[PDB]
Amino acid sequence: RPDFCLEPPYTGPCKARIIRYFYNAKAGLCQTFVYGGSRAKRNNFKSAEDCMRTCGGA
Amino acid sequence: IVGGYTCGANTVPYQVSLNSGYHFCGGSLINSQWVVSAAHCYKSGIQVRLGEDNINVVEGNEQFISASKSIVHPSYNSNTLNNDIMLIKLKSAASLXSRVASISLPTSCASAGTQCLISGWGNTKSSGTSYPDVLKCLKAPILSDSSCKSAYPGQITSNMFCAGYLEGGKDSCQGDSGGPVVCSGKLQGIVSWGSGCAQKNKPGVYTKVCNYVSWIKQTIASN
Ligand SMILES: [Ca+2]
Ligand SMILES: [Ca+2]
Ligand code: NA
Numbered sequence A: 001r002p003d004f005c006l007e008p009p010y011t012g013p014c015k016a017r018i019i020r021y022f023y024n025a026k027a028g029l030c031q032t033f034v035y036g037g038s039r040a041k042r043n044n045f046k047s048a049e050d051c052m053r054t055c056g057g058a
Numbered sequence B: 001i002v003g004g005y006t007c008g009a010n011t012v013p014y015q016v017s018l019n020s021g022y023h024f025c026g027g028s029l030i031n032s033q034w035v036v037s038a039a040h041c042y043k044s045g046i047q048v049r050l051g052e053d054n055i056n057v058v059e060g061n062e063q064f065i066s067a068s069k070s071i072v073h074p075s076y077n078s079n080t081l082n083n084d085i086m087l088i089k090l091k092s093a094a095s096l097x098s099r100v101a102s103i104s105l106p107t108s109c110a111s112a113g114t115q116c117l118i119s120g121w122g123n124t125k126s127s128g129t130s131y132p133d134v135l136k137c138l139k140a141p142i143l144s145d146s147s148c149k150s151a152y153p154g155q156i157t158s159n160m161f162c163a164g165y166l167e168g169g170k171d172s173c174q175g176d177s178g179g180p181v182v183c184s185g186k187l188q189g190i191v192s193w194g195s196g197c198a199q200k201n202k203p204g205v206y207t208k209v210c211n212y213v214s215w216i217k218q219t220i221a222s223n
Helices: A048-055 B145-151 B213-221
Strands: A018-024 A029-035 B015-019 B023-031 B034-037 B047-050 B063-072 B086-090 B115-120 B136-141 B160-163 B180-183 B186-193 B204-208
Touching (some): A018 A048, A029 A048, B023 B047, B023 B180, B023 B213, B034 B186, B086 B213, B115 B186, B145 B160, B160 B186
Antiparallel strands (some): A018 A029, B015 B023, B015 B047, B023 B034, B034 B086, B115 B180, B186 B204
């Protein structure tokens, strides 16, 4: 099945500026991005630790 | 805010910033102890920042007050974004004067074409990223329900309204959510969502505050 850890970060339609983490497969690390507040995809984490635990090594 | 202008220090006294270690949403002060924002702006450890202009520097007129309660509308749907409204109670009453003031709730809904003031510390670029230090303002008109539905097929509910310019270039953007849309001195909208920011044929969508006045008043009074 498609690895959700490899999907580009999704800001969504909502207009908040919430900092979340996503696994950047190209760089091999969890990076920060702007999340809009709703309709989050799975490659969206509240902390670097959550991101690494879920997507580390993808 | 994309395509707007610098409001001027404390020229929008009801505009507040929601902070969770950084600015993430806006809000509107409706009385000394209550703020109206968007349901999708619900976050842990919210601190409401009043009397703000430069969001990155202490200028002397700020009041930082923690949220003691955050009541998301009981019918908020995170998928459809229907009922995107939240009420925040201030842990201690804010000191109201000229620089920190409340905005009146509407007595009736505003008609299409009505000019309104939209404000916030959100992204100022339609393509790219640039967040302002000072508060940004934008004058935009309320758009018809028909035009709103045509722009966003099967997405506009009775609790949403569009505002802006169809040609693009002027709109609210990421970081503006929860903020005000004030028309003729009344809070008619809450910055909610849209397809990107300032894109042609994609005006901003806002929560229709006029549909929640009774709920707001009763909820505030029961908390
Ligand atoms: Ca990063
Ligand atoms: Ca400041
Ligand atoms: Na200033």
